[PDB]
Amino acid sequence: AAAAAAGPEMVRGQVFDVGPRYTNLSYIGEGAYGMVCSAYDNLNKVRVAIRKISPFEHQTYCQRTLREIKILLRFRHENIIGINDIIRAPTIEQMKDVYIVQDLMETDLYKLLKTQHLSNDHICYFLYQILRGLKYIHSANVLHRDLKPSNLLLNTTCDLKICDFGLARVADPDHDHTGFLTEYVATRWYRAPEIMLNSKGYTKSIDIWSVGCILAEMLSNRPIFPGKHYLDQLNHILGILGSPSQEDLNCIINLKARNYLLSLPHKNKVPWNRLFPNADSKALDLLDKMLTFNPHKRIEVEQALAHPYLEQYYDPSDEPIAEAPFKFDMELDDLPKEKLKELIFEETARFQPGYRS
Ligand SMILES: Nc1ncnc2c1ncn2[C@@H]1O[C@H](COP(=O)(O)OP(=O)(O)OP(=O)(O)O)[C@@H](O)[C@H]1O
Numbered sequence: 001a002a003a004a005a006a007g008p009e010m011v012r013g014q015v016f017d018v019g020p021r022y023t024n025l026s027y028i029g030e031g032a033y034g035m036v037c038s039a040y041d042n043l044n045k046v047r048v049a050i051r052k053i054s055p056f057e058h059q060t061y062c063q064r065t066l067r068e069i070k071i072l073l074r075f076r077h078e079n080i081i082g083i084n085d086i087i088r089a090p091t092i093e094q095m096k097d098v099y100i101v102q103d104l105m106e107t108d109l110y111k112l113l114k115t116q117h118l119s120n121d122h123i124c125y126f127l128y129q130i131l132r133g134l135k136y137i138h139s140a141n142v143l144h145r146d147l148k149p150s151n152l153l154l155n156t157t158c159d160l161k162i163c164d165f166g167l168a169r170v171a172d173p174d175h176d177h178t179g180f181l182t183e184y185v186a187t188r189w190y191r192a193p194e195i196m197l198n199s200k201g202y203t204k205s206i207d208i209w210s211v212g213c214i215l216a217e218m219l220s221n222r223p224i225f226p227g228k229h230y231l232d233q234l235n236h237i238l239g240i241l242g243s244p245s246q247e248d249l250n251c252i253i254n255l256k257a258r259n260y261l262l263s264l265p266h267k268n269k270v271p272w273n274r275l276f277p278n279a280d281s282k283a284l285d286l287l288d289k290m291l292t293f294n295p296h297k298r299i300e301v302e303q304a305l306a307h308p309y310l311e312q313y314y315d316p317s318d319e320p321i322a323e324a325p326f327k328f329d330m331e332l333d334d335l336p337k338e339k340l341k342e343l344i345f346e347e348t349a350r351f352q353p354g355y356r357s
């Protein structure tokens with residue numbers, strides 16, 4: 001009833017009406033895209049998180065929005081955040097924003113790592129849950145493409161949930177190759193080496209590298225490859241990984257990519273134990289297999305789960321897989337934000353009280 005607002009001060013922190021169902025409100029940070037706040041879900045009498053989304057003005061937010069709604073609505077896993085509610089106007093004409101309701105999670109890996117020091121058992125359990133959730137995503141043929149500590153939510157019992165599927169895509173190996181130094185949108189620091197060389201990021205091994213980066217950050221509380229820019233990122237990787245072999249260079253048919261790599265002075269590998277002196281030797285072995293320069297040699301999710309470091313948790317029949325692979329036609333740098341809006345409206349209909357009143 002609009003008679004519901006929450007200290008805008010900037011962005012869209014003004015109006016924030018979510019009907020009769022969500023009482024007690026409190027802002028939880030925001031952004032120039034949507035505002036976040038906890039609220040009291042009376043029907044369930046529990047506290048949830050509501051994100052205000054205002055995408056119809058920007059077709060890239062509209063595509064990221066529709067995309068995330070369809071996937072998050074199809075997935076059902078303990079380690080992947082889920083949409084519990086979606087609040088919007090009754091008609092397309094009146095729909096300006098959307099409110100996605102999800103479980104309330106106290107913190108995320110990003111903030112935790114900024115203050116806490118994880119124990120090896122905490123590290124193993126967090127890694128276990130990431131891979132468990134990731135095995136489900138990859139089984140549906142979807143790639144997250146933007147995994148990083150801030151995309152991993154934690155509650156007080158150390159339950160982890162993957163969120164943010166705005167950059168997710170269906171796997172496409174046949175259309176992954178591209179030129180050298182191709183623009184990319186995912187977070188620089190967790191970007192696979194092949195992205196700056198000849199990959200579009202349409203492969204599952206792209207996610208494994210990111211999880212590899214996350215493990216290292218957990219082991220030291222510091223990002224392991226913080227390039228300040230595109231190529232700097234790549235030189236951070238080669239500095240620890242050292243110069244790639246011939247066999248690996250032989251896999252780069254891309255001439256511009258290959259010649260740049262050959263133009264570089266030789267660098268020896270820096271052993272992980274010199275980098276993480278108090279790390280569990282098993283964790284470092286796995287860290288090694290994930291942060292493998294060659295995407296074809298990089299370890300698979302299922303393989304990561306069955307690794308000795310995780311034997312305390314590994315249990316195949318307790319690590320579910322998608323019922324049917326995902327798919328959604330439109331995956332293009334374009335689709336009229338006129339068509340998307342009426343598509344978002346339709347995707348969100350199941351949450352309207354038309355089936356209650
Ligand atoms: N279910 C939720 N639990 C608690 N707060 C939330 C919930 N929704 C995201 N978090 C936290 O609220 C914040 C803002 O919302 P969102 O996830 O869209 O952006 P973000 O994680 O801050 O950054 P980004 O712009 O990369 O998404 C982050 O601190 C995030 O970890």
Ligand SMILES: [Mg+2]
Nearest residue numbers: 150151163164
């Ligand atoms: Mg996020």
